[PDB]
């Protein structure tokens, strides 16, 4: 109940570091390859005894393009997250001027908390994750091809080259596991690169809807 929880926290942290790196944020190669022993060293080893506390695991990263773009990853201690803790996190994000945040919950999040997350969307973009979903990195599964987020200029070039309207592309849901992993919203286009047994390689595009 303690070694297992420590292993779980280490796995969640590793997956979150991989996710942050994949989204373009700055992460050092040592954080990505941090061993379980290094986790027990830097952080505690008795989560039951409060070492480490989930509040000790919060991370803050900055984008590679502009340091002004920053993201929190919070680990609420309470297995079910309600509006109050969301308001707390929003308050500190506002205080520090951070517009993005990931919230890793244990059991889930109350329906009203989800409604709050979506309500303050345009100002603050904060996303929810079950820790069970973060115990592995789904982008490393053999069934998951490489997904790449396209820039607006790239999307314009694509639609011009193939003379398509957006609604003619294949679709991906915003609630898709990979879409949530990359944090892409409605109207963005993800480029998918997969091997093919006939051509060798094949690029397809999906619009987020």
């Amino acid at each position: 109940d303690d070694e297992e929880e420590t292993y779980r926290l280490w796995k969640i942290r590793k997956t979150i570091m991989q996710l942050c790196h994949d989204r373009g944020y700055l992460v050092t190669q040592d954080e990505l390859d941090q061993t379980l022993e290094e986790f027990k060293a830097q952080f505690g080893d008795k989560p039951s005894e409060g070492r480490p506390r989930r509040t000790d695991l919060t991370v803050l990263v900055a984008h590679n393009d502009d340091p002004t773009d920053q993201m929190f990853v919070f680990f609420p201690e309470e297995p079910k997250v309600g509006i109050k803790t969301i308001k707390v996190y929003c308050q500190r994000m506002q205080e520090e001027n951070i517009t993005r945040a990931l919230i890793v919950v244990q059991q889930g999040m109350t329906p009203s908390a989800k409604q709050s997350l979506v309500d303050m969307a345009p100002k603050y973009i904060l996303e929810q994750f079950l820790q069970q979903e973060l115990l592995i990195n789904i982008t490393e599964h053999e069934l998951v091809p490489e997904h790449v987020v396209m820039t607006k200029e790239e999307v314009t070039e694509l639609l011009a080259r193939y003379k398509l309207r957006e609604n003619q592309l294949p679709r991906i849901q915003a609630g898709d596991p990979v879409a949530r992993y990359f944090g892409i919203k409605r109207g963005q286009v993800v480029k998918i690169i997969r091997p093919s047994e006939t051509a060798g390689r094949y690029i397809t595009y999906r619009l987020v809807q």
Binding site: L26, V27, T28, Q29, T58, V59, L60, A62, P67, E96
Partner: peptide, 29 residues
């Protein structure tokens, strides 16, 4: 040339470590 890119990694390693300490007070604060 490969050594040059080795230097850049440390620069980015520094560029992140430098701001982690500044951030660290922020997560504390």
């Amino acid at each position: 040339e490969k050594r040059l890119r080795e230097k850049e990694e440390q620069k980015k390693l520094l560029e992140q470590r430098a701001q982690y300490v500044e951030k660290t007070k922020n997560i504390l604060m």
